Design a protein around this motif. Structure first.
Motif, mmCIF file in Angstrom:
data_model
loop_
_atom_site.group_PDB
_atom_site.id
_atom_site.type_symbol
_atom_site.label_atom_id
_atom_site.label_comp_id
_atom_site.label_asym_id
_atom_site.label_seq_id
_atom_site.Cartn_x
_atom_site.Cartn_y
_atom_site.Cartn_z
ATOM 1 N N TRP A 188 -12.906 -28.208 -15.805
ATOM 2 C CA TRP A 188 -11.714 -28.290 -14.988
ATOM 3 C C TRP A 188 -12.134 -29.072 -13.740
ATOM 4 O O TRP A 188 -13.160 -28.776 -13.137
ATOM 5 C CB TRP A 188 -11.263 -26.870 -14.630
ATOM 6 C CG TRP A 188 -9.942 -26.802 -13.933
ATOM 7 C CD1 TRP A 188 -9.707 -26.983 -12.605
ATOM 8 C CD2 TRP A 188 -8.674 -26.519 -14.530
ATOM 9 N NE1 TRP A 188 -8.381 -26.827 -12.336
ATOM 10 C CE2 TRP A 188 -7.717 -26.543 -13.499
ATOM 11 C CE3 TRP A 188 -8.253 -26.245 -15.837
ATOM 12 C CZ2 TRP A 188 -6.354 -26.302 -13.729
ATOM 13 C CZ3 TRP A 188 -6.904 -26.006 -16.071
ATOM 14 C CH2 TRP A 188 -5.967 -26.036 -15.019
ATOM 15 N N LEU A 196 -8.727 -35.487 -20.851
ATOM 16 C CA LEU A 196 -8.079 -34.207 -20.626
ATOM 17 C C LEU A 196 -7.589 -33.622 -21.939
ATOM 18 O O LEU A 196 -6.487 -33.934 -22.390
ATOM 19 C CB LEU A 196 -6.934 -34.352 -19.629
ATOM 20 C CG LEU A 196 -7.486 -34.655 -18.233
ATOM 21 C CD1 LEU A 196 -6.531 -35.507 -17.427
ATOM 22 C CD2 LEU A 196 -7.834 -33.371 -17.525
ATOM 23 N N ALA A 244 -5.621 -23.751 -19.690
ATOM 24 C CA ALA A 244 -5.812 -25.111 -20.149
ATOM 25 C C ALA A 244 -4.640 -25.910 -19.578
ATOM 26 O O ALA A 244 -4.511 -27.124 -19.821
ATOM 27 C CB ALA A 244 -5.786 -25.160 -21.656
ATOM 28 N N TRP A 245 -3.790 -25.216 -18.817
ATOM 29 C CA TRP A 245 -2.609 -25.822 -18.217
ATOM 30 C C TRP A 245 -2.834 -26.220 -16.760
ATOM 31 O O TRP A 245 -2.870 -25.358 -15.885
ATOM 32 C CB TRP A 245 -1.426 -24.845 -18.315
ATOM 33 C CG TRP A 245 -0.113 -25.394 -17.817
ATOM 34 C CD1 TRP A 245 0.351 -25.377 -16.532
ATOM 35 C CD2 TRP A 245 0.876 -26.086 -18.590
ATOM 36 N NE1 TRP A 245 1.552 -26.021 -16.463
ATOM 37 C CE2 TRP A 245 1.900 -26.464 -17.711
ATOM 38 C CE3 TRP A 245 0.990 -26.422 -19.946
ATOM 39 C CZ2 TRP A 245 3.030 -27.172 -18.139
ATOM 40 C CZ3 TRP A 245 2.110 -27.121 -20.371
ATOM 41 C CH2 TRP A 245 3.114 -27.486 -19.470
ATOM 42 N N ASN A 246 -3.047 -27.510 -16.509
ATOM 43 C CA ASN A 246 -3.232 -27.995 -15.149
ATOM 44 C C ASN A 246 -1.979 -28.749 -14.719
ATOM 45 O O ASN A 246 -1.674 -29.822 -15.249
ATOM 46 C CB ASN A 246 -4.450 -28.904 -15.021
ATOM 47 C CG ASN A 246 -4.712 -29.322 -13.578
ATOM 48 O OD1 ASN A 246 -3.797 -29.426 -12.779
ATOM 49 N ND2 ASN A 246 -5.960 -29.575 -13.251
ATOM 50 N N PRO A 266 -1.259 -29.028 -23.261
ATOM 51 C CA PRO A 266 -1.730 -27.936 -24.121
ATOM 52 C C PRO A 266 -0.658 -27.016 -24.715
ATOM 53 O O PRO A 266 0.208 -26.487 -24.001
ATOM 54 C CB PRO A 266 -2.702 -27.183 -23.215
ATOM 55 C CG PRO A 266 -3.264 -28.278 -22.369
ATOM 56 C CD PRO A 266 -2.047 -29.099 -22.022
ATOM 57 N N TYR A 325 -8.681 -29.922 -24.685
ATOM 58 C CA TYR A 325 -9.286 -28.587 -24.622
ATOM 59 C C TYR A 325 -10.747 -28.436 -24.224
ATOM 60 O O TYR A 325 -11.075 -27.508 -23.488
ATOM 61 C CB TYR A 325 -9.025 -27.801 -25.894
ATOM 62 C CG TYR A 325 -7.569 -27.545 -26.158
ATOM 63 C CD1 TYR A 325 -6.835 -26.683 -25.349
ATOM 64 C CD2 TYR A 325 -6.919 -28.155 -27.223
ATOM 65 C CE1 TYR A 325 -5.491 -26.446 -25.606
ATOM 66 C CE2 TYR A 325 -5.575 -27.922 -27.485
ATOM 67 C CZ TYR A 325 -4.874 -27.073 -26.677
ATOM 68 O OH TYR A 325 -3.555 -26.839 -26.938
ATOM 69 N N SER A 350 -12.638 -30.288 -22.210
ATOM 70 C CA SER A 350 -12.813 -30.503 -20.779
ATOM 71 C C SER A 350 -12.020 -29.463 -19.979
ATOM 72 O O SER A 350 -12.433 -29.061 -18.897
ATOM 73 C CB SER A 350 -12.382 -31.919 -20.380
ATOM 74 O OG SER A 350 -10.971 -32.074 -20.375
ATOM 75 N N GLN A 351 -10.885 -29.018 -20.508
ATOM 76 C CA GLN A 351 -10.086 -28.005 -19.812
ATOM 77 C C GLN A 351 -10.891 -26.707 -19.662
ATOM 78 O O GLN A 351 -11.175 -26.259 -18.555
ATOM 79 C CB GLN A 351 -8.782 -27.729 -20.568
ATOM 80 C CG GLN A 351 -7.583 -28.462 -20.009
ATOM 81 C CD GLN A 351 -6.936 -29.427 -21.002
ATOM 82 O OE1 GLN A 351 -6.511 -30.522 -20.622
ATOM 83 N NE2 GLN A 351 -6.847 -29.025 -22.267
ATOM 84 N N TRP A 352 -11.328 -26.171 -20.795
ATOM 85 C CA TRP A 352 -12.086 -24.936 -20.850
ATOM 86 C C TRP A 352 -13.384 -24.917 -20.069
ATOM 87 O O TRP A 352 -13.734 -23.884 -19.503
ATOM 88 C CB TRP A 352 -12.448 -24.616 -22.290
ATOM 89 C CG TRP A 352 -11.326 -24.269 -23.195
ATOM 90 C CD1 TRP A 352 -10.001 -24.243 -22.900
ATOM 91 C CD2 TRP A 352 -11.451 -23.819 -24.548
ATOM 92 N NE1 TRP A 352 -9.286 -23.788 -23.982
ATOM 93 C CE2 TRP A 352 -10.151 -23.521 -25.009
ATOM 94 C CE3 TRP A 352 -12.536 -23.632 -25.415
ATOM 95 C CZ2 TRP A 352 -9.904 -23.044 -26.298
ATOM 96 C CZ3 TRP A 352 -12.293 -23.160 -26.692
ATOM 97 C CH2 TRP A 352 -10.984 -22.870 -27.125
ATOM 98 N N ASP A 373 -2.033 -32.359 -14.018
ATOM 99 C CA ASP A 373 -2.206 -33.167 -15.224
ATOM 100 C C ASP A 373 -1.099 -33.122 -16.247
ATOM 101 O O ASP A 373 -0.903 -34.088 -16.981
ATOM 102 C CB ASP A 373 -3.517 -32.818 -15.922
ATOM 103 C CG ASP A 373 -4.716 -33.366 -15.204
ATOM 104 O OD1 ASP A 373 -4.702 -34.563 -14.869
ATOM 105 O OD2 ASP A 373 -5.678 -32.616 -14.968
#
Lengths: 316, 316
Positions: free
Chosen positions: A153, A144, A184-186, A197, A146, A148-150, A189
């Motif tokens: 998800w 987790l 990028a804010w989950n 992030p 940037y 994989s975030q971008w 997570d």
């Protein structure tokens, strides 16, 4: 001059900053809520009053654009910015047996011969990831982060979402969307991530055949990070505009908690004595538009002529 | 005067706005990237140069604070702001047999006798939800809306996260956290939602025993929405500060695409002729601190003395 907003941020934090407690020891002066924009048509906002290594940001952003999350790509580019995050998890393995370390860096600030041995262990780490496949796989992948975030998800339904891919296509079909966001804010997570992030989410905007992007940053180191932060999101803009056969516009940088550590005061006072030079120009391979299949040599910076780099202790 | 930033936003959009295509017919003048703050110690930022119904925002925010997502609570408070969203889904049911409607409101702009009958159907809807339990349950619940986002984020592992509850506790234990964020933007949910959150995410900040909050809004109607938007997040601030036995500070309102529809030009020109009056003061029940178990009469507005309301077509 193009970079003035940065110099203005530095001044501002130095006058209006209130002392604050940091999760460190090295206190900070901070402010909350601030906005600065950079007309990208006027040049690429890479600080000239201080030497900032483009190559590093250039490689890191491709690491992001490739959906990559493994340290190997960066080490394969002499980029050691993410080394501590992955290393950390490694010295917390049963495979790890060597010399003990408890929250290093900080523990390397009061630098003994230890730091040097630590240097040999990072060496020993990096190389492992660099030549052995299975190693690179267990400790080289950060997960987790940037990349994989971008573009990966993770859904509740087990699948994976390509936020950036979807929004680039979106810009192409509906350039006037106020829904062109990639977070990028989950929430699920954020509570167990060593580093949630700092760059929380961004938004694109097509004004007049011109792309613009705003970045919302929750925390920021005025001296160390922002100089990199600016170039990264100004470059993203250039790449998205590129693929989208769109002209470039403005880059807005919004902040939550912008701060400057106390141990950077003399360093920022000094960089402020310097007057800015004309800003550099960017170039992207014309014969190539898939910013995801982009390679290092497809991005060229021109006329970058900066003042020397300022040496400052890395945030503590 | 406290509300000037709003008046300045209105002026600014009117000069620097570029014409833009809206998902409507009624064009807009827009801008991208803007920040305005309100020192809450100087009074509660409820527009005085225009009458804005507090009761409605007061009830809607409690609807949010209660983790509520059912229209019944609002109808049970004469709040009809969310009626179209839920109604919509109802006239798209097999239970629905009455007069047809295809994207009303807009289809009610060119108002025929139809709109009046539509009025009878909303009547017929609201009342259903208002007195029948099972009905309220299938069409009254909106699901993915602010109340569930803030306090019932759904995980992949089947559970549910209370973002706001966790952050309030967080403010209490670690008031100097740059991680005090609550997002309402869920990537997995954003592509099929009729209305992805306009208020994308917010951040708290404790400066000097003082709470402050910044809101990042992706889209905004300068004339219609912002006046409500300001009071809502300035109130949240007051409530969180309240529970957290903390003083109040500043409310920053950040925007992505701030716009003003063309059909509101004469209306905003006029509201701009008026000079602001002293701003009202808020009061929260001292003998009560659980902002979640809060009720309507626990929030009192004092000295609100505004100029008349400006009648303008609801964004089209």
């Amino acid at each position: 001059m193009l970079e003035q907003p940065y110099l203005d941020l530095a001044k501002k934090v130095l006058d209006e900053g209130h002392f604050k407690p940091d999760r460190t020891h090295t206190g900070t002066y901070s402010i909350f809520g601030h906005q600065m924009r950079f007309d990208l048509s006027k040049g690429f906002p890479l600080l000239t009053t201080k030497k900032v290594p483009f190559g590093l940001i250039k490689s890191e952003l491709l690491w992001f654009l490739h959906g990559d999350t493994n340290i190997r790509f960066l080490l394969q580019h002499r980029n050691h910015i993410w080394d501590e995050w992955a290393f950390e998890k490694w010295v917390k393995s049963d495979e790890y047996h060597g010399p003990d370390m408890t929250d290093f860096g900080h523990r390397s600030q009061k630098d003994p011969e230890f730091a040097a041995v630590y240097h040999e262990e990072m060496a020993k780490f990096d190389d492992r990831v660099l030549h052995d496949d299975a190693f690179a796989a267990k400790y080289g992948d950060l997960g987790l982060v940037y990349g994989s975030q971008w573009r990966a998800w993770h859904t509740s339904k087990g699948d994976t979402i390509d936020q950036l891919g979807d929004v680039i296509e979106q810009i192409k079909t509906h350039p006037y969307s106020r829904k062109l966001i990639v977070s990028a804010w989950n929430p699920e997570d954020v509570p167990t991530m060593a580093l949630p992030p700092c760059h929380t989410l961004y938004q694109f905007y097509v004004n007049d055949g011109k792309l613009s992007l705003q970045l919302y940053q929750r925390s920021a180191d005025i001296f160390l990070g922002v100089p990199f932060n600016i170039a990264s999101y100004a470059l993203l803009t250039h790449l998205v505009a590129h693929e989208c056969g769109l002209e470039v516009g403005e880059f807005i940088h919004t902040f939550g908690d912008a701060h400057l550590y106390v141990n950077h005061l003399d360093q920022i006072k000094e960089q402020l004595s310097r007057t800015p030079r004309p800003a550099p120009t960017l170039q992207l391979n014309p014969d190539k538009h898939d910013i995801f299949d982009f390679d290092m040599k497809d991005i060229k910076l021109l006329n970058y002529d900066p003042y020397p780099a300022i040496k400052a202790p890395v945030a503590v």
